[PDB]
Amino acid sequence: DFAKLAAAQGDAIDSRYHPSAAVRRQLNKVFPTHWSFLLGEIALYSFIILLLTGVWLTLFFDPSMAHVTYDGVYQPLRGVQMSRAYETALDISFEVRGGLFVRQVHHWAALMFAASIMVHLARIFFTGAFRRPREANWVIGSLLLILAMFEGYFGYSLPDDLLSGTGIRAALSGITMGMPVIGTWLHWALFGGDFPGEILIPRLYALHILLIPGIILALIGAHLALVWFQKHTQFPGPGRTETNVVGVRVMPVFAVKSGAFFAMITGVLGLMGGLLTINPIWNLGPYKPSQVSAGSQPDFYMMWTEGLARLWPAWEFYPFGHTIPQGVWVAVGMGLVFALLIAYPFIEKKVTGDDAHHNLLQRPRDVPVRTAIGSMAIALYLLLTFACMNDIIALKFHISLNATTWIGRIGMVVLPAIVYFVAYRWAISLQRSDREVLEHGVETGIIKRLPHGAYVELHQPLGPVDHPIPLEYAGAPLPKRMNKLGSGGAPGTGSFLFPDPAVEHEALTEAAHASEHKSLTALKEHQDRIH
Amino acid sequence: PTDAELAEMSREELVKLGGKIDGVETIFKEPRWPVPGTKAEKRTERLVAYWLMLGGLSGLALLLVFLFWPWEYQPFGSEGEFLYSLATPLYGLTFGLSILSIGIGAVLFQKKFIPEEISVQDRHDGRSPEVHRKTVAANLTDALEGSTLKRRKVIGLSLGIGLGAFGAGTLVAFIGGLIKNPWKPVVPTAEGKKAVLWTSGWTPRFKGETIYLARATGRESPFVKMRPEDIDAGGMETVFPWRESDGDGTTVESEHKLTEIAMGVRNPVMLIRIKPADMHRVIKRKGQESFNFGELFAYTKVCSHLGCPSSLYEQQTYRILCPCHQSQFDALEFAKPIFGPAARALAQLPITIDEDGYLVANGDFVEPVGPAFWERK
Amino acid sequence: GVDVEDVPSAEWGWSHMPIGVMHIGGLLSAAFLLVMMRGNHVGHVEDWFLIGFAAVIVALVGRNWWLRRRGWIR
């Protein structure tokens, strides 16, 4: 019954819009199946969650800095004077069925959005996918990272509570106010006056629900358009070449895989939003300029900034009648970091003179210098992040606050150098391990004592033998365990408690072995013919 | 291929032709269960079915728990608080379990039943073929040359001038509503009108104004006068500038004034009574040698680094600590920053007592209070 | 700037950093550790930690520079 309906709908669609050639082109598109190429998709899916829950939260939030008395259901804040935004956030958490769940799913989705953007950036940087022709796509990704950081900052600043208000007062007010020539002008353009104003929360709400989400949506659209029409990169392999893409077509493998990954990511976010508490605002109270708390940290994607401000050593300048405070350094710091993130492909293009079209990715071990730089930057970022959390670390792990401060100060110099050295040597050593495997064959772990007393290990050559002929490295991973090449065999087929009849075992094992040979043969023929 | 021979192609041949048109060759594609009628196929089918059914039952559990669980907030230490505490975790459990099980079932169906394939597509990337590049370049150059705008410099110059002028005017008329002068005198003072950053609630307004150091009771009458004997040695107090003409919170204008003094970012003051056995250790700042009243000193409760409340008073070290970035000022040395990213001392408020004995401010801060800026000093 | 014997996969990606960058980096890191002794702190244990780490860095740079200047290290 549905076949005739499908045929008639397809005929109507083709008669009206004639999309057949374009739809077939989009269905036949080939995407490589590496797991790391899924990392970016996480940042996509969480963002969609951030839209959905976000819209829900817009139906109950009043972003007014007007001050009222609570008279809600939450007793430990009855009669407390608070802003209207804080009261509406409390009403979401307590007066709307499922409001707390939506708030927590939203905050968890924001955290996963930031974290997955960071992990995807690590993948892109270490595999060298920022190279020509994909430099602009790296620029777009860096802009998206910055926008997501500031979007999350504004988001958790929206409910005017003690912690978020303290973060606003510290960063967005103090750093802005201290900028050399235009700092107070920027502060009074943003806040409409002094920090404890009346327009900040509505302005941040407008920026955070409409403006930044719109910019991020447009940038993600352009990003994915570039990825789609500049076909995905790939790692060097059996059938791979700079002029092809080896993987699976969109219909139906890629579509089903992407949908199932979306569903599983939504499941993880829902489980975390239900079972784990995030941002319990009612415990913090309304924001008051006279109160602060010991544990003053932003969401983790901003933590590094505070760490920088915690570690930079009180260096201020006093030109003719003017003051340049310490916070200026922090601002410049961030600027430099963002700058150094946006223009990295061009920096490496200038340094190495490599301006060739590249579609085959690089394993990080094959680029020891870039791997060393990336490990150095990750070490510095982690150190600043933990220096932001050095009060909690001091409290839980018994260590003095000054000790953590000086460890951070000395570390932001010593640790990146050690990490650079270790990463460089480790990458070259991984290269050497690859060469050893290619030249002697895989070590099988089997030791024989020859009649004259020789203890030898059985090597399994990956190519022909003359001792094997040493193969040539081709930028691809190599096997180093025999169970990964099939030596481990197959278990008896069954239900983990009862076997199937041996005829079915024979049929299935023989069919699977034949299919594996057929797949390897097809790849071998394609490789031989194209080369 | 013609219509007649297209009419006589099998579906596999048509798929091959369609892929070949797009540049895709599927070099391997084999069914997942070549051997018919095995128990393993039944087992895998039932596994996928069980995962999808768990997703369905968890979605049903989500519906039921959402509709029927007792969700309303319950006060502290009462019956029904355990069910309330379980309300949101149950929503998360049911929702996440349902959609995660559906996703797992889909993954298992892909891995176990959808045939494994290896397709190869040609990138066709890099430079375009010369025909396309030359035709598009010729179209663009022909537009620019037939326009004749190049050989008409007056029109081009006028167009540039006009577009730039309109853009500048629009940008100025756009941003200009946000631009506020921070130094427009708007705050009254016993010395005229002064900018906001130069003034706080401690700034006297009619040249002899009695400004009381009032504690926050945190309640109708949230501020009250206080006496020097209301602070034991080694004790810390947060005081605010409260005047007689501010009220007691009964009338609505009184509450507005009390709110506006409680929300003043530069209002809070830390008042500390040094133990006399340590008053020999006090080093006083030049120009503030007479700002304390005996054992009671008063400093700003605003960090000089970035404006957070430096509100951690360690009495046995006399150290003021700011939790935002771990700055440490020495309360025995005019709040000089001894540690952290702070490089400027906290302002000291001059205090004394009135005729009745109630602690009052003996003038204004002798410097700007909060974090520094360009125009300071 | 490297050979296949030193970095096997040298043709495949960026694999050499000029030793000047490392030498001036060490000198600048030592200078930063030293200049961090000017500031606001009563105690002087941190000054000795900074001096020790700067000494270690300068010693490493000096040894590496000397050995490349004499020929042993390349």
Binding site: - | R285, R344, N362 | -
Partner: peptide, 28 residues
């Protein structure tokens, strides 16, 4: 990454200073 400068107007003193006088407030 440069040096530090002390605030020009943050020196210490040696004068002990006089005890503050009792406060009287003008009527308006």
């Amino acid at each position: 990454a440069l040096s530090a400068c002390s605030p020009p107007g943050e020196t210490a003193s040696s004068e002990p200073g006089t005890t503050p006088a009792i406060w009287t407030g003008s009527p308006s």
